[PDB]
Amino acid sequence: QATINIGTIGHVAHGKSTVVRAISGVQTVRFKDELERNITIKLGYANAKIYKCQEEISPKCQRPGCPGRYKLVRHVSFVDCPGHDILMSTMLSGAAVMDAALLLIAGNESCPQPQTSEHLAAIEIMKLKHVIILQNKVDLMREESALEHQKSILKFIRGTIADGAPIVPISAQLKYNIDAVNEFIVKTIPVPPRDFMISPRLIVIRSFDVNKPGAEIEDLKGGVAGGSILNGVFKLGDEIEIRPGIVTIQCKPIFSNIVSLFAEQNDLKFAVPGGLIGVGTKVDPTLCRADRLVGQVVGAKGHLPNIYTDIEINYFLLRRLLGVKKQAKVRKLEPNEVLMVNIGSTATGARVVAVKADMARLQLTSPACTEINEKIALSRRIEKHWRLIGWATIKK
């Protein structure tokens, strides 16, 4: 299974899906007949193999020359997140999901790439600081150009929150210097404390509708969803509730029972948290058909998540705007403006009722559940689409 969640960010027309494919080996489907060429909407998934040889892609090693094979060390999941301006809510959902980061920087293009820096700021928002700078293009640069880009990256990233960022050369086609990537992932990035102590919770980020067409309906599978666990282990034979629930505007909880837990190759009864798992339950597949189970907080029975509409939030904004090559100063919030307030994974633009310099009250059209902290991101409507302006946290 998966122990720690890892994600990759990069600018548009930069190359991350094929990079992870050279890292993991699992094809990124990039489906729906329009996402194949411009951008994606749903999240990409992949699984890496970490068997380290201490005298790699396979559990048995033959390439190094010495017949010695590698032993089991780590098996880490990878959540490909699209770095484009159109979609940000799923980016922030995955950003709250991921624990390790891989940033791409393009040489011959403009060295400050607006989406790379924007998603680096997003990384620094949600307590992510173990980031490895990757030069996604290596063959397409000269040696002097590479040195200039190295110095430019160093001078640009000196005083940010992410200070200790090792640099790695990668490509999407060659498939070389890859063991360095795995080595640095194992070294710089430890698994966050995740054991039996904290109560179990779930965050579902995607909806899978499983109804095999053409086959007789007498035997079909239920509703499976992709979820991440920040605390505790899920075991088979438990009653679970999808808390954001169904709309009967008001919403009401969904109750169900676990049928299976796909864990990275198969169906495992137990699963240490820190990896994306396929929870297949008796839920109606139509509830898993469209973008429905995207950013929903899920509870194991025996806990009572609280449904909220009015939320008191401590929020902070940065000095300047992000995601633009013109730029303007950050302006203090005004009442009666719909601003998207993503609680870790949720996608709901709230109305601002109370305005303070460092505090706010916001009302969600769709009520959402709150358990402990559930870190938040804040986006406004300025550049004809959603633009990050700051970060938010629930305080009640």
Binding site: Q135, Q150, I153, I167, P169, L174, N177
Partner: peptide, 23 residues
């Protein structure tokens, strides 16, 4: 510090030139 990265970049160029002299 980006010192141990230029070494891997040099190794990358060496491998690319060795395996694909055409490109």
């Amino acid at each position: 510090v980006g010192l141990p990265y230029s070494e891997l970049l040099s190794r990358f160029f060496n491998i690319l030139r060795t395996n694909n002299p055409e490109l």
